[PDB]
Amino acid sequence: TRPANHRQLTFEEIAKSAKITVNEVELLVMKALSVGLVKGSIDEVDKRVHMTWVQPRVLDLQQIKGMKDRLEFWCTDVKSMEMLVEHQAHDILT
Amino acid sequence: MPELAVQKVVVHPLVLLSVVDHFNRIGKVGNQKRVVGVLLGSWQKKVLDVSNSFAVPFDEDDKDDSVWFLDHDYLENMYGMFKKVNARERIVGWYHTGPKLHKNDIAINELMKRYCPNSVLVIIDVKPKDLGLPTEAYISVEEVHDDGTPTSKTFEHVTSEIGAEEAEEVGVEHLLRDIKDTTVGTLSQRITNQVHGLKGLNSKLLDIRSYLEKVATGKLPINHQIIYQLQDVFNLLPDVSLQEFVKAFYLKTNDQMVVVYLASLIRSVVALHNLINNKIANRDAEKKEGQE
Amino acid sequence: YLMEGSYNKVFLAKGNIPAESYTFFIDILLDTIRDEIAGCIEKAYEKILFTEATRILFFNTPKKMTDYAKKRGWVLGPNNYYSFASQQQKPEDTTIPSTELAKQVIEYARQLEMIV
C-alpha cells in the first residue's frame, strides 16, 4: 500500500493487523525475509521495518490504468532532459 | 540459453550488406516479403560469430501461416559448396528480414535445426530507421509456466552487436569517407553517446506506454507476466534512500571538480608557456627580417 | 544605525531635537523601523513574554500589540509563541540543482572543444 519513500512500518502498526503482540512479529518478519516475500532489514531499536522489495502479484484493469499515467509521467521527464542536452551540448559539440 | 553456450551474437558487416543485397535480388514484385537465408559462421564460447550467408529460395502465404516453403535440398547442396571453399563454416543459424517476428518463424526454426542445434535467428532490417542496431538475435528455447499451460517453443532475446576484422574494418572505413565521423573528437563523441542514449530510453519506454495503454482500453487480453516485470521496474527506481544519497553524491562531485580544477590549470600554464615560445621566436625573427 | 540594524534609533528620533524640522519629518521612518525589527525577531527568538514584545517594538499599550501579533500571525498563550519560518524546510534537495549543474558541465565541454 505504501508506495514511496514512505516504506517503513512500525512494529505496533504490523501487530494490530497481524493479531499478535510485538514479540512474535520479529520472528514473523524473519520467515518472510527467509522465503523471499520480503527483502530488507529490521531496525529493531526504533521499531522500524525496511520494506525494500516485495514480490509481484496480479493486478486488475483498474490498477493498470494508474500505472499507465505513472509511467507516462516518467516519459516526459526523459523527453525534456534529452531536450535539455540537445540544446547547448548537441548544438556545438555535435 | 540457460546454457552459457550462447550470448554475444556478433555479425560482421559483409553479412549485413549481404542480406540487404538479397532483399533486392528477390525484389521485383516479390518484395514486401520476408526473405530468409542461412547464417554460416564459427564460434567456441558465449559467441556466435556470423560471417557468411546466402539466400535460400523461400516462399510464404500472405494470409496463412502453415503454407511456407524452404528448399532445404538447396541448403544441403550449397552448404557443401561453401565448405569446399572454406573449412570451419558450419551453419550457426539463419536470418529473416524482419520487420519483426511472425508466428510462422518457430516452424522454420525446426527445419533449420535439422542441421545444427543452437540455431539462432538474426532479425536484420531492410529499412534504416531504428537508432539502435538493426540486428536482434533470438533463440528457440522452451519452458514451463506457473499458470500450468503446456510447454511451448517461445523465442528468447540475447544481446547483440556487430564486430569486425581487419578486412571488414578497412572496407567499411573506405565506404564512409563521404559521411565523415572522425572529425568529431573524444569528449564530444561521448557526450553524443549520452544524448543518443536518452534517444533510446525515450522510445523504449514509449513502446511500453503504448502497450499498457493497449490492454487497458481497446482491449487486448492481459498477459500477467509483462505486468509482473513492470512492477519490479517501479520498485527498482532510485528513490527511497533520498536524503543520504543526496549528501553523498554532492561529495563525490566535489572531488570531481577538485581534479578538473587541477587539470584545466596545468593546461593553462602549459599553453601560456607555448605563447612565451612564440613571442621569443618572433623577436629573433625580427632581427632576421632586418639585416640586408 | 539604519543600514546596519541597530535600535536605539527609535529613541534618537526624538533626541534629534536641535533642529525641530528633523523631528517633524523623521516620524515617517518609524513605520519601517518596526517592520525590520519584527522581520528579524520572527527568526531570532521563539518564546518571549507579551509585555516584552510591547517593550521592544516601542509600544506603550497591550491593544496595539494584539493587532501586530495578529498581522504576523502569532498565538497568545502566557508567553507570545513563535512559528518556525527561519529555515522551515531545508535545501536538502540537489534534485533542484540537477538540471543546472548539468548545463554547467556541458558548458565546460564547449570551451574545451571549440576551435580557438
From Swiss-Prot, chain A:
Domain of life: Eukaryota
Modification sites for N6-acetyllysine: 16
Record field: transmembrane: none
Subunit structure: Component of the 19S proteasome regulatory particle complex. The 26S proteasome consists of a 20S core particle (CP) and two 19S regulatory subunits (RP). The regulatory particle is made of a lid composed of 9 subunits including PSMD13, a base containing 6 ATPases and few additional components.
Biological role stated in the UniProt entry: Component of the 26S proteasome, a multiprotein complex involved in the ATP-dependent degradation of ubiquitinated proteins. This complex plays a key role in the maintenance of protein homeostasis by removing misfolded or damaged proteins, which could impair cellular functions, and by removing proteins whose functions are no longer required. Therefore, the proteasome participates in numerous cellular processes, including cell cycle progression, apoptosis, or DNA damage repair.
Similarity section: Belongs to the proteasome subunit S11 family.
Annotated protein name in UniProt: 26S proteasome non-ATPase regulatory subunit 13
Protein species of origin: Homo sapiens (Human)
Phylogenetic classification of the source organism: Eukaryota, Metazoa, Chordata, Craniata, Vertebrata
Gene behind the chain: PSMD13
Residues of the full protein shown: 283 to 376 of 376
Swiss-Prot record, chain B:
Other comments on record: Does not bind a metal ion.
Chain ranges of the MPN domain: 9-144
Acetylation in keyword set: yes
InterPro entries: EIF3F/CSN6-like_C, JAMM/MPN+_dom, MPN, MPN_RPN7_8
Gene Ontology molecular function: any one: protein homodimerization activity
Top-level taxonomy: Eukaryota, Metazoa, Chordata, Craniata, Vertebrata
UniProt subunit comment: Component of the 19S proteasome regulatory particle complex. The 26S proteasome consists of a 20S core particle (CP) and two 19S regulatory subunits (RP). The regulatory particle is made of a lid composed of 9 subunits including PSMD7, a base containing 6 ATPases and few additional components. Within the complex, PSMD7 interacts with subunit PSMD4 through their respective MPN domain. Interacts with TRIM5.
Family the UniProt entry places it in: Belongs to the peptidase M67A family.
Cross-link (Glycyl lysine isopeptide (Lys-Gly) (interchain with G-Cter in ubiquitin)): 180
Gene Ontology, cellular component aspect: cytosol; extracellular exosome; extracellular region; ficolin-1-rich granule lumen; membrane; nucleoplasm; nucleus; proteasome complex
Lineage top rank: taxon: Eukaryota
Alphabetically ordered keywords of this record: Acetylation, Isopeptide bond, Proteasome, Ubl conjugation
Modified residues (N6-acetyllysine): 204, 214
Protein name: 26S proteasome non-ATPase regulatory subunit 7
Chain's role: Component of the 26S proteasome, a multiprotein complex involved in the ATP-dependent degradation of ubiquitinated proteins. This complex plays a key role in the maintenance of protein homeostasis by removing misfolded or damaged proteins, which could impair cellular functions, and by removing proteins whose functions are no longer required. Therefore, the proteasome participates in numerous cellular processes, including cell cycle progression, apoptosis, or DNA damage repair.
SMART domains the UniProt entry points to: JAB_MPN
Pfam family, one: MitMem_reg
GO biological process: proteasome-mediated ubiquitin-dependent protein catabolic process
Organism: Homo sapiens
UniProtKB/Swiss-Prot annotation, chain C:
Cross-link (Glycyl lysine isopeptide (Lys-Gly) (interchain with G-Cter in SUMO2)), chain numbering: 63
Subunit and interaction comment: Component of the 19S proteasome regulatory particle complex. The 26S proteasome consists of a 20S core particle (CP) and two 19S regulatory subunits (RP). The regulatory particle is made of a lid composed of 9 subunits including PSMD8, a base containing 6 ATPases and few additional components. Interacts with DDI2. Interacts with TASOR.
Similarity section: Belongs to the proteasome subunit S14 family.
Primary role: Component of the 26S proteasome, a multiprotein complex involved in the ATP-dependent degradation of ubiquitinated proteins. This complex plays a key role in the maintenance of protein homeostasis by removing misfolded or damaged proteins, which could impair cellular functions, and by removing proteins whose functions are no longer required. Therefore, the proteasome participates in numerous cellular processes, including cell cycle progression, apoptosis, or DNA damage repair.
The protein's name: 26S proteasome non-ATPase regulatory subunit 8
Name of the coding gene: PSMD8
Portion of the full-length sequence here: 235 to 350 of 350
